């Protein structure tokens, strides 16, 4: 299942289920998301959100970075979505 | 709790169980060698420096 690592930070059950909820967006593609792992982390500039996920058609890896933690997470999902649509459509150039 | 620590391992207290190797250079409790009196780090620095008698990079 889904695991979240808050590294050097005091996180909460509420924001944990929020990240579970934002990641749910990838369920859209109807493709197996295998042992997804997010890592939330502070930084002097702003937060950092990483995720590494494997799927039947390959693996997703990406970093969000931003002042607001929530916009960092959104940025992370935005980057992940792209990667996922690419694994899903890539060889359709099958002419 | 640090430099006081290295002192506490010097004079040998109530029970002999409480004996633990520290090291001479750094006060390191972890990965001390009996033969050298050294940690694995200190050991390395010295060996490379040539200050450890007949001690050489292995290679077989």
């Amino acid at each position: 299942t889904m695991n979240i690592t808050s590294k050097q930070m005091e996180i909460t059950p509420a924001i944990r289920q929020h990240v579970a909820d934002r990641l749910a967006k990838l369920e859209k593609w109807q493709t197996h998301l295998i042992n997804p792992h997010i890592i939330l982390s502070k930084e002097p500039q702003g937060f950092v959100a990483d995720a590494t996920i494997n799927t039947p058609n390959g693996v997703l890896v990406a970093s969000g970075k931003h002042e607001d933690m929530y916009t960092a997470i959104n940025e992370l999902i935005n980057k992940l979505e792209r990667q996922l649509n690419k694994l899903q459509h890539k060889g359709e150039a099958r002419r | 709790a640090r430099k006081a620590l290295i002192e506490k391992a010097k004079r040998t207290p109530k029970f002999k169980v409480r004996a633990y190797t520290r090291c001479v250079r750094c006060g390191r409790a972890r990965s001390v060698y009996r033969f050298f009196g050294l940690c694995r780090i200190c050991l390395r620095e010295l060996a490379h420096k040539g200050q450890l008698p007949g001690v050489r990079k292995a290679s077989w």
Binding site: - | V24, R25, R34, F35, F36, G37, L46, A47, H48, K49, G50, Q51, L52, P53, G54, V55, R56, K57
Partner: protein, 206 residues
């Protein structure tokens, strides 16, 4: 974050140990722990001497304690007095027969520890670091070598961002088992923090 120590890498080949003796289990630690007290006593006190290297010998209750050096004066002194004040204090900790010794080093600018601690003290002295480095190499190559390399790293000239400065003339082939590469390291503690210095001297093929 990769390179093997060019002295350690040649121990037994181009270069040889600075403590030479034999022991076995029960007393090695202690023998050794002596040397490194000796070394501390010396390197502190004998700092402004120059030097590089201290060879050390042992038989029984007998320490040969050799010292190579830049200027032997600050050891021997007037008539050979201080040579003895030391031959004492060594013996006080040695608890055994000390022999304080002085060998002079030939072109102290052909010696790695010596060249690197000069640029080192020059940096603590607030000097242009890039220029200090070209020079310290210049000096070496002028007095001969087959090549020379020198490395400073840290807040160079006090820069917030760390930086690392690099200069070399002629060959320094650290992959070659017979290099005769003399390498030495100093440390500059400035008002703002510590900078590392590394010198490399290619003396030639064995």
């Amino acid at each position: 974050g990769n390179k093997i120590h060019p002295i350690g890498f040649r121990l037994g080949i181009t270069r040889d140990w600075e403590s030479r003796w034999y022991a076995g289990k029960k007393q090695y630690r202690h023998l050794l722990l002596e040397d490194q007290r000796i070394r501390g006593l010396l390197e502190k006190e004998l700092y402004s001497a120059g030097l590089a290297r201290v060879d050390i010998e042992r038989a029984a209750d007998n320490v040969a304690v050799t010292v190579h050096v830049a200027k032997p004066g600050v050891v021997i002194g007037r008539g050979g007095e201080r040579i003895r004040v030391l031959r004492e204090e060594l013996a006080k900790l040695t608890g055994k027969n000390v022999a304080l010794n002085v060998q002079e080093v030939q072109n102290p600018n052909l010696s790695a520890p010596l060249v690197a601690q000069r640029v080192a003290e020059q940096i603590e002295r607030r000097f242009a670091v890039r220029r200090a480095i070209k020079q310290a190499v210049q000096r070496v190559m002028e007095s001969g070598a087959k090549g020379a390399k020198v490395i400073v790293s840290g807040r160079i000239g006090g820069a917030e961002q760390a930086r690392t400065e690099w200069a070399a003339q002629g060959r320094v082939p650290l992959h070659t088992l017979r290099a005769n590469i003399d390498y030495g390291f100093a440390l500059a503690r400035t008002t703002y923090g510590v900078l590392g210095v590394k010198a490399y001297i290619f003396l030639g093929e064995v």
